[PDB]
Design a protein around this ligand. Structure first.
Ligand SMILES: O=C(O)CCCC[C@@H]1SC[C@@H]2NC(=O)N[C@@H]21
Ligand SMILES: O=C(O)CCCC[C@@H]1SC[C@@H]2NC(=O)N[C@@H]21
Ligand SMILES: O=C(O)CCCC[C@@H]1SC[C@@H]2NC(=O)N[C@@H]21
Ligand SMILES: O=C(O)CCCC[C@@H]1SC[C@@H]2NC(=O)N[C@@H]21
Lengths: 121, 123, 118, 122
């Protein structure tokens, strides 16, 4: 149930296909930051999750370069898909910017995004 | 020789074998020296294929879902960081390891850490 | 009067805090989850002269998970910001470090996020 | 406990701490980087009765980045463990939250890792 169009609390759009091989492929469009238009994503998910009520572990990466704007940064989301009547993907993320060695201590932002198939309002 | 493409090792002795594609793709295998993992796991990721021209590192990230034919750990790790070139080439990362959990156990689903990768084989 | 009070998070944990004029946070934490049993000492710091443009007040605190009931050999730090008003919130991210052997240090630290309501 | 003293991280920042009998950490922090200027107050907690199986001692502390010289409208928390041995170490991960508007809250928090030893930089 991972395949589809997802939205987070910021109103960003996460369009993803979950392949039989455990691959995630798609596009991400951020409502915030330096990003402009859709960016390529790739990731992985557990294609045979536990059947004890546990969620399905997954992660994906966006490098923030496309033909519109290169932000010289990359975000990875790590989380789990939680199935049901109102499906959710709950994630934590790390956004690393390319920095000088002197500035490496401030290279990485951390946050958390929750994704639903309904766009928040 | 120089570049992201190659075989990398972290401080734990894990092996990260990666090819950096022309269009920003990272593809390869990861073998962890620690945890539930056994043998090689598929990785995919992305990197900035046109980094800044001011001495900055190259932003990148990748994911391993910890399922292969040896063991399924029902977990996934993402590494986010940057590649630093030169004579002491590094990939410096922070990571998030999320385990599949029940909703009641979700608060303790995610480990955080940091891995530094070098092309030098451990001694 | 804003930060000072009793707060609950999404897990149902209880956060009792006094924000002093000197920038100090002092109080007790009781977790709804995990190894912890009963109230634990907290101490922390907050920006005692924040911006008023809609910007939150930066803060953080620590609990070492040792009391007379259970010693969990762990500590959590919460880092975040207080947002004032009738629906006041403390929005945090946290790091929970367990005492580990050097071999297990790679899996010493859990990360998460807690939102507190007054 | 071995925690009490002056510690230095990989950035050259100075961490002057006292570990009290009641589990308290008190002292000052001076960052070599960022908006911070001069010494800032810290407070924290540590496990005053750790395991005896070779495990580290869990601890954490907070600095709010306000002093008489500069207020950065930010706060860092370090969470980690003290590791005894030939060269003692405090290994930490940290979260640095800046006061932001609601619309900017997604980019409020930096994450990193600091390792402290008692070796003064030369
Ligand atoms: O500003 C940049 O460097 C690129 C855009 C980053 C947007 C971040 S990624 C994590 C968070 N979740 C979102 O949907 N957007 C922000
Ligand atoms: O135990 C698991 O759930 C799977 C193996 C996790 C290994 C982690 S990933 C982050 C860290 N870096 C490594 O090289 N290994 C550990
Ligand atoms: O299990 C332990 O080691 C001690 C209790 C940890 C409880 C954690 S702290 C962060 C999160 N927020 C809570 O209110 N409880 C959990
Ligand atoms: O820039 C600020 O907002 C205040 C100074 C932050 C300095 C950070 S705290 C984490 C890291 N470790 C250090 O010693 N300095 C930086």
């Amino acid at each position: 149930g991972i395949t589809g169009t997802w939205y987070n609390q910021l109103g960003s759009t996460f369009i993803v296909t979950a392949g039989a091989d455990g691959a995630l492929t798609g596009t991400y469009e951020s409502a915030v930051g330096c990003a402009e238009s859709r960016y390529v994503l790739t990731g992985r998910y557990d294609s045979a999750p536990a059947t004890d009520g546990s969620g399905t572990a997954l992660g994906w990466t966006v490098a923030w370069k496309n033909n519109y704007r290169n932000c010289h940064s990359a975000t990875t989301w790590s989380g789990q898909y939680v199935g049901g009547a109102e499906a959710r993907i709950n994630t934590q993320w790390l956004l690393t910017s390319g920095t000088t060695e002197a500035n490496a201590w401030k290279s990485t932002l951390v946050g958390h995004d929750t994704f639903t198939k309904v766009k928040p309002s």
